[PDB]
Each structure stands twice: as C-alpha cells, then as structure tokens.
Amino acid sequence: ELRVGLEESELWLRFKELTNEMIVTKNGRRMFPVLKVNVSGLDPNAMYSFLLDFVAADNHRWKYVNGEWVPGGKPEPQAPSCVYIHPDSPNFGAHWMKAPVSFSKVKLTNKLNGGGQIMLNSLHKYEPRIHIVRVGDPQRMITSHCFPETQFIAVTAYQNEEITALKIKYN
C-alpha cells in the first residue's frame, strides 16, 4: 500500500502550535523546516516524478493583532498555480523509497521573477501538497498527499517573535 509519511512531524508541530510563518521575498526564500517525506509501496521498478504545490487554506487573509493571528480581511485573487518538480525527477520507485525525499531547494516568493519559485500571497495560509506522477502512463495516474502539520502563513517579515526565535533555535 502506498504510504507517504511526514519526516520530523514533532518539529513541524512545534511551529504549527505557534502558527507557522514562512518568509516570501522578491528573489525567493527556502523553507524552514524543510518538507521531507518517507515513501513505501511504490513499484520499485516503475519511474515517478515528485511535484510540490501549495493549497490556499481559507477564503480570507490573516493579521497578527495583540499577539494573536485573526481573520484580517477578504483574500487577494489566488496566486498562479506554481508546481515545483523535485530535482531527482524522474526516478525509480526504489530511489524515492531508499531515503527520505527532501524539498530543500524550493523557494517561496511574492514576485513572479521566474527561477521555478512558488508565488504565494503575503498574510494568506497555505498547506503543502505532494503529487506522485507515474512516468510513461497512458492514464497519467497521479497521487496527491496533503500535510496538515506543515500549514503556515506566508509573511514578508516574522510577526510572532516566538517563531523568529524557534527558527534560530532549530535552524
């Protein structure tokens, strides 16, 4: 049976209980923590690509008020559908399953300034989602996993000083 498990779930949860924040910049910022998953029950002989996108979690934006995240207005029009191809794509099931799959090079941006970056809206909540794409398949079979532990708000700067501190502590 295909299983995709979140690595360092305990670490993600320490950020999620504060409300997680990720920085977006003109030139794109790598994530901390890094999304890493373990994979079982692929066909070790088949070839697959791994894709990552970010699903808008709400029909409103957020604001940090009196040390609390609160609904902060109506949303902006949704960010363009940005998909990151894991640089090991395409590869054998055996490759994907032998060691955790790390998305360490993906960059979050608030400008469509190219470079395979993911465009997000500041002060909007996103949930990372991994797709597994079987190569050479006439049915173009895809599997999608969502990682609710990894929810965060895109920010141009940290709002919660505890998040700022957590990021320095564990990174």
Which spans of this chain sit near ligand O0V (rule: CB under 6 A)? 8, 10-11, 14, 170
In whole angstroms, the minimum distance from the beta carbon of 8 to ligand O0V comes to: 4
Q: String of b and e for 132-158 (b: at least 16 CB within 10 Å)?
A: bbbeeeeeeeeeebebebbbbbbbeeb
Q: Which is nearer to ligand O0V, 15 or 84 (CB)?
A: 15
> Angle 9-16/161-170 helices, nearest 10 degrees?
160
> Phi/psi zone of residue 85: left (φ > 0), alpha (ψ -120 to 50 degrees), beta?
beta
- Rounded to a whole number of angstroms, the minimum distance from the CB of residue 79 to ligand O0V is 29
Report how far residue 137's alpha carbon sits from residue 135's, in angstroms, rounded to the nearest whole number.
Answer: 6
Residue 99 CB, shortest distance to ligand O0V, in Å, is 16
Of 7 and 88, which has the nearer Cβ to ligand O0V?
A: 7
Residue tagged 């960059």 (tokens): 107
Q: How far is the CB of 15 from ligand O0V (least distance, A)?
A: 10
In the bound state with ligand O0V, the residue whose beta carbon lies nearer, of 30 and 111, is 30
